[PDB]
């Protein structure tokens, strides 16, 4: 009945189209600058039609989704502003940054058009539409950044359009999105590339260095092999946030130099202990975690089948697990399994079920 | 038959004792400051006999292995020097740093006792003798740092003692060892802890960082969960090398600040391109100075029993899992479920076992 236009029919666009058709009877018209991709999307029933005219498809659309790169989306929003769109249209994107997009949207569309920025924290550009899946974004954070004027009810309509994603939707202001993604995603990319560059500089002086960088060092710097073109565009789009963070990092490295140079075993130990305790605690369940969840800690032995037996007991009781991880918080073979549940009642059933099987459990550690 | 003394019967010590007994009929006498550890080592046939006094066992030893922490080894070498050791004895350690150890050894033993420093580059999610394995060091670098006047014949005898490790032995000078390990192993550990500290500081201001930091960013900082006691001793023992590297790092971050602040897309792209090309050149699926993650990513649907089925498949193949997690922040990472293994062989078997049951899996490059 309703019409969706999808601009950029890759892995991300295609997976959104599949998530949408999962929960909605809609015609999806695909548009892509790479003709072969959209053709392939129509061949795979990811889209129902290929856009003959971009204007024509857009002017009949209830929903317009940009899955194009941020720089391309910015350019097309101008075109979108010159069209006569439906009164009820929702427009959204999938960009890794939101500041520049939302600046352009506010300048072009304010009050008239429901533009809501988006950022699904799953997927890649390493494959195309051939590997698209309705569940690509299942239990991924999906950040939405409504323009200042967009009523709460339009944001709920978009979450409804996208309910088939099974994403944890978070509504943030634009600055907050770029601030938080600057710290947890963009900044590590700068440091990963810097670590590789420092090893590369010394590799000239000793040939052993390239060989000893296999394994863990390669694993730690994984994100340094991501697209230089894409990451240079993100650094440009989030430049001011990253400049503030780099200046604070340099100050932190100068304090770390003073700690190391002082040789005080106490101070250095505290520095490693603080980092270990914070990292081990992630994610830190708080009051304001929008997806509210409930933790059970279980003492488990490091042996074949330990996790198999725990998960088998919870599955037989029809308890869904939202997350789990192992903490090395004991002395020998004993480890702690942290299990997260959506509902308090699931945690309670899990505690009872494991208690009857003679497991030690706790609700705080 | 020949006599081995093992001083410190933990993970690394115990694994060496098992690798020794694999290829040699010997009596191994265990000595440990924690009585229950060496008792447990005897219970597990890691050692043949226990000593609570060093002198008698050491004076009849053909081989003495220090697998105590480097600060403790340094202290015990004095005691060893006061004993009347065999003419043919070889003495070795397993310390992550070699400068301080070799300084103490050269002061105590020069031209008299065959002391050869050692550093097997292998790790574990665990400490303690119950996690010791004959195969811990297979295809790992094992660095030997002989004192200046140790006959090369004694280095060959030691490689023969330890042939059951299946390690790649390298003979290095002491300074070279601490310089190379400073760059490829110690310095990254400092930066991983620094990154955690910076994110922790901002999590105070926006508690959303405590939630969105559990996925991707956890990857570069995984090593920050390693032993603070061990890493504070390594930073102490390698202080001067790490001071020089921190000052270089600060200078590199200042140049990176100038690049980012100039906003030039070309220059920033070149910076990421150089890092990507160097990282892509590093060896594939090989052991280096930092233990590799051995991560397998698995596409699973959010259903009751999804983890039960995956863990059951791996347990039926007798594969031990070190860790697992559901990723909620996973841009550039296909596969919602991440599973970690002790070694590449386990990950390879896990990929085959899950493949046979029609699970899609992914490994990073
Ligand atoms: N753990 C690794 O990943 C790794 C890697 C390479 C090298 N190493 C080196 O090996 C050393 C041993 O590490 P591990 O991982 O086997 O630790 P561990 O805790 O498993 O074993 C160390 C053992 O030494 C004993 N010990 C401590 N002080 C002693 C003393 N004064 N006298 C006698 N025994 C004493 C402890 O009780 C323990 O059993 C580390 O300090 C490190 O320098 C470790
Ligand atoms: N090795 C266990 C899981 C586990 C891992 C580490 C531990 O410390 C404890 C348990 C399994 O395969 O099920
Ligand atoms: N709910 C699943 C685990 C799971 C959670 C989230 C996912 O996206 C996928 C799987 C179980 O109980 O086994």
From TrEMBL, chains A, B:
Coiled coil regions, renumbered to chain: none
Gene Ontology biological process terms, A to Z: tyrosine biosynthetic process
Gene3D superfamilies xrefs: 6-phosphogluconate dehydrogenase C-terminal like domain, NAD(P)-binding Rossmann-like Domain
Reaction(s) catalysed (UniProt annotation): prephenate + NAD(+) = 3-(4-hydroxyphenyl)pyruvate + CO2 + NADH
Annotated positions binding Ca(2+): 318
Prephenate/arogenate dehydrogenase domain residues: 2-290
Residue ranges crossing the lipid bilayer per the database entry: none
Entry EC number(s): 1.3.1.12
Record-listed NAD(+) binding positions: 11-12, 32, 68, 72, 96, 124, 128
Residue ranges constituting the ACT domain according to the UniProt record: 295-365
Pathway(s) annotated for this protein in UniProt: Amino-acid biosynthesis; L-tyrosine biosynthesis; (4-hydroxyphenyl)pyruvate from prephenate (NAD(+) route): step 1/1
Annotated InterPro entries: 6-PGluconate_DH-like_C_sf (IPR008927), ACT-like_dom_sf (IPR045865), ACT_dom (IPR002912), AHAS_small-like_ACT (IPR054480), NAD(P)-bd_dom_sf (IPR036291), PDH_C (IPR046825), PDH_N (IPR046826), Preph/Arog_dehydrog (IPR050812)
Keywords of the record: Amino-acid biosynthesis, Aromatic amino acid biosynthesis, Calcium, Metal-binding, NAD, Nucleotide-binding, Oxidoreductase, Tyrosine biosynthesis
MF (Gene Ontology): metal ion binding; NAD+ binding; prephenate dehydrogenase (NAD+) activity; prephenate dehydrogenase (NADP+) activity
Pfam family for this entry, one: PDH_C
Protein family (similarity comment): Belongs to the prephenate/arogenate dehydrogenase family.
Protein name: Prephenate dehydrogenase
């Amino acid at each position: 009945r309703k019409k969706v236009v999808l601009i950029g029919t890759g892995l991300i666009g295609g997976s959104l189209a599949l998530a949408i058709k999962k929960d909605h009877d809609v015609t999806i018209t695909g548009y892509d600058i790479f003709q072969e991709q959209v053709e392939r999307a129509k061949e795979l029933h990811v889209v129902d039609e290929i856009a003959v005219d971009l204007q024509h498809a857009c002017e009949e659309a209830h929903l317009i989704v940009f899955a194009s790169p941020v720089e391309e989306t910015k350019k097309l929003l101008h075109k979108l502003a010159s069209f006569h769109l439906r009164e009820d249209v929702i427009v959204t994107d999938v960009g890794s940054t939101k500041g520049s997009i939302m600046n352009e949207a506010e300048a072009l569309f304010s009050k008239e058009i429901s533009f809501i920025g988006g950022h699904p924290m799953a997927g890649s550009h390493k494959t195309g539409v051939e590997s698209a899946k309705a569940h690509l974004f299942e239990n991924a954070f999906y950040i939405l950044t409504p323009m200042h004027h967009v009523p709460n009810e339009h944001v709920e309509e978009l979450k409804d359009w996208l309910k088939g994603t099974g994403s944890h939707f978070l509504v943030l202001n634009t600055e907050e999105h770029d601030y938080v993604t600057g710290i947890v995603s963009h900044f590590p990319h700068l440091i990963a590339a810097g670590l590789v560059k420092q090893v590369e500089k010394h590799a000239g002086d000793n040939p052993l260095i390239h060989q000893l960088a296999a394994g863990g060092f390669k694993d730690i710097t994984r994100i340094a092999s991501s697209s230089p073109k894409m990451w240079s565009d993100i650094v440009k789009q989030n430049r001011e946030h990253l400049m503030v963070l780099l200046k604070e990092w340099i100050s932190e490295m100068e304090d770390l130099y003073d700690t190391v140079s002082s040789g005080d075993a106490g101070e250095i130990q505290n520095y490693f202990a603080d980092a270990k305790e914070y990292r081990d605690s992630l994610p830190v369940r708080k009051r304001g975690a929008i997806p509210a969840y409930h933790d059970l800690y279980v003492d488990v032995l490091d042996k074949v089948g330990a996790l198999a037996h725990v998960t088998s007991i919870l599955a037989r009781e029809e308890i869904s697990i939202t997350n789990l991880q192992i903490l090395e918080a004991r002395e020998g073979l004993l480890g702690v399994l942290r299990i997260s549940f959506q509902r308090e009642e699931d945690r309670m059933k899990a505690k009872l079920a494991l208690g009857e099987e003679k497991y030690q459990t706790y609700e705080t550690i």
